[PDB]
Amino acid sequence: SPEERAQLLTAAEKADELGCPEERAQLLTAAEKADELG
């Protein structure tokens, strides 16, 4: 899912940049999960 991947992947990057440990775990996995969903 490209649309969701773009939203989730950028969120994952922001989570890293914002330094949120709790959020990054969910966001990083979501970024890759959205890609898995295509």
Longest dimension (CA), the chain: 27
Contact 30, 12 (CB under 8 A): yes
Specify whether the CB–CB gap between 8 and 34 falls below 8 A: yes
Tokens encoding 1: 């899912």
What does residue 3 show for φ and ψ, rounded to 5 degrees?
Answer: -60, -45
Alpha-helical segments (H) within 1-38: 2-18, 21-37
Task: Enter the DSSP assignment of 19.
Answer: T
Residue of 33, 27, 6, 3 whose CA lies nearest to 15: 27
The owner of tokens 């709790």 is 22
- Structural domain boundaries of the chain? 2-37
The answer to whether residues 5 and 32 touch, using CB atoms and an 8 Å cutoff, is no
34 in Cβ contact with 5 (< 8 Å): yes
Written as six digits, the tokens of 5 are 């991947």
